Amino acid sequence: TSQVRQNYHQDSEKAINRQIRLELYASYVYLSMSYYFDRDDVALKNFAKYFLHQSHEEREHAEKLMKLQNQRGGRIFLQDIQKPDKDDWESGLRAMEKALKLEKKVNQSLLELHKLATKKNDPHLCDFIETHYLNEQVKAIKELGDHVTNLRKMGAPRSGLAEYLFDKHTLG
Amino acid sequence: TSQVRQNYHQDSEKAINRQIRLELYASYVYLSMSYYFDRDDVALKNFAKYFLHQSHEEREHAEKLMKLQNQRGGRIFLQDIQKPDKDDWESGLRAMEKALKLEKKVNQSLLELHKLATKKNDPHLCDFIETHYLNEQVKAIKELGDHVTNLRKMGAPRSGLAEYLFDKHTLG
Amino acid sequence: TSQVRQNYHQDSEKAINRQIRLELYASYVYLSMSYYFDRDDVALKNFAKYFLHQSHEEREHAEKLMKLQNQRGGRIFLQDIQKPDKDDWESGLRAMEKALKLEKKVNQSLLELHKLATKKNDPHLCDFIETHYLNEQVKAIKELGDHVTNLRKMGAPRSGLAEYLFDKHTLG
Amino acid sequence: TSQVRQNYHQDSEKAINRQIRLELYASYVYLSMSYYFDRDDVALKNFAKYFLHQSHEEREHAEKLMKLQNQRGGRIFLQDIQKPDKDDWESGLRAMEKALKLEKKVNQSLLELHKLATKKNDPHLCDFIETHYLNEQVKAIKELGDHVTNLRKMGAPRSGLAEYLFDKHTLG
Ligand SMILES: [Fe+3]
Ligand SMILES: [Fe+3]
Numbered sequence A, B, C, D: 001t002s003q004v005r006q007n008y009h010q011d012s013e014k015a016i017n018r019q020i021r022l023e024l025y026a027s028y029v030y031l032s033m034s035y036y037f038d039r040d041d042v043a044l045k046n047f048a049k050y051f052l053h054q055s056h057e058e059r060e061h062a063e064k065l066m067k068l069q070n071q072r073g074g075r076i077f078l079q080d081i082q083k084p085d086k087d088d089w090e091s092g093l094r095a096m097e098k099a100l101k102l103e104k105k106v107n108q109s110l111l112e113l114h115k116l117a118t119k120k121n122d123p124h125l126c127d128f129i130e131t132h133y134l135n136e137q138v139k140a141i142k143e144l145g146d147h148v149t150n151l152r153k154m155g156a157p158r159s160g161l162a163e164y165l166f167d168k169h170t171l172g
């Protein structure tokens, strides 16, 4: 047992390791999406910039969980980071829809992790998830839904003019 | 009954007065530790300054609980502050080990207080403990673990050179 | 065929996708190394910061290859990022030795990629590798050699004092 | 023989004079495109500015080769600069397509020049072409590809708004 460990359940420790993997997976998906928009046959520089920003943010989400693991005296165990489900993300609209799906899946995992922290009477871990992750997820999901709504209303993905103008005026 | 009092259990009010006592006791332990390092036959000026800083922090912890008691309309009952376990703290490593033990003791008390607040459905007191106390304890405990590890690996307490160089390069 | 594609061999396009994977793997190795030094029972804060900096650098190496692939009109295919060889990196000296081995592995891959670019008479890809990668690897390898030498000469890994003082005076 | 001449093949010297002529030709094509967009019946001022910038850039490309010829002790022979293929470039999209074709033609000449310098074991001339020309061409080709993709996806040339909005939001 780590000299620092106190009120830290082994189940919570294993769950935090799985959350670190999910955050690194989310970073990877956003990295894939970013460079799709950098393609010469897609060429939406602000979609590329937006998703690269998201990719770097997911890496910081992972690093903060790795810090928490060591803070509580847990031990980090890393697994392969799986490739994203798509190589070609089709359109700005379809990428935003897939990003919204991703953020809701990450959110579901955080809520399962909170339920487990609640069941193991770990208020420090409850506070950590609430303070640093749950509202970040709500804001992310709201923002992506807003993006999806505007792109659909403007006539995306059939209107290449819609994706062009959204890229300039919302993401730029 | 105080005109402000709302959703505040007698048991929670009592538990806060016990916490105030423990925070003052912790302030007193770190004060004794500080001036042990100020002895001409110990003479580790940065260990002394480290533990005096910790002493002042514990007094601020006590004051914020006293403020909380009056915010909630509870009544402060102060008790004798027990003298520390040791007069002579033996070494840098032994003082850091006792500080780690002290911080886990205070953390255990905060976790029992949070369990009580949760049982009495006092979300304001739960938030207060989580926001102001629980991550402060985790950080304190991780830092003291880090310090114990480094001193042990350097060859303390048998190396007077180890504690000298740790005083200069880590606490300095 | 991409409208931009000119003098870019399928074999070079494939080799760039393998290089992107290796750069991401190297980022993942250095991330695991970083948080090993962040453990309460290792507690070498400058080793931790050193390896996290190296992790962020490898991610930037990957991104510039992804940009290159799209510049040349190749298509990015991402793969699973393999977990690092070790969960526990044992010591400062052992992590630096593994980092030196990692950097020579990445360097070997870049030299094989340059051999391919030379065979396919791709001067743009040759220049890209030489300008952005090959002297970065030589400098990384010389620096890690220097660090291994100093730690060995100081008495690591058996001196906890050696790794402590190297953390303070070289990585600090 | 020039007192400065060293490792400079007569074939290389002649190829440099041919490259000077092509760079001057490129400057002329861009000048022609620029003032097409300045017409009262075309009136796309940011298309006009973009192509004039490209014209001045190509003049710089020609002057750096003329400096190189003299640095190596070769002798400049200038020839008639051929008029561009068109007086009327028809549209923003069609001008960007012809510009993409031009940059690929200039890039091919530079790759043939590099092949000759390689065959003549002229590393100074290889480095000159790689450092100053090859990545400039890759960047120019990627940019024009991106521009062509955007104008196409916006609905150029059937869409009335597309060229107008691209001139404002991309080239402005
Ligand atoms: Fe995240
Ligand atoms: Fe306290």
Ligand SMILES: [Fe+3]
Pocket (backbone or CB within 6 Å): C023, C026, C057, C058, C061, C106
């Ligand atoms: Fe690298």
Ligand SMILES: [Fe+3]
Pocket (backbone or CB within 6 Å): D023, D026, D057, D058, D061, D106
């Ligand atoms: Fe040119």
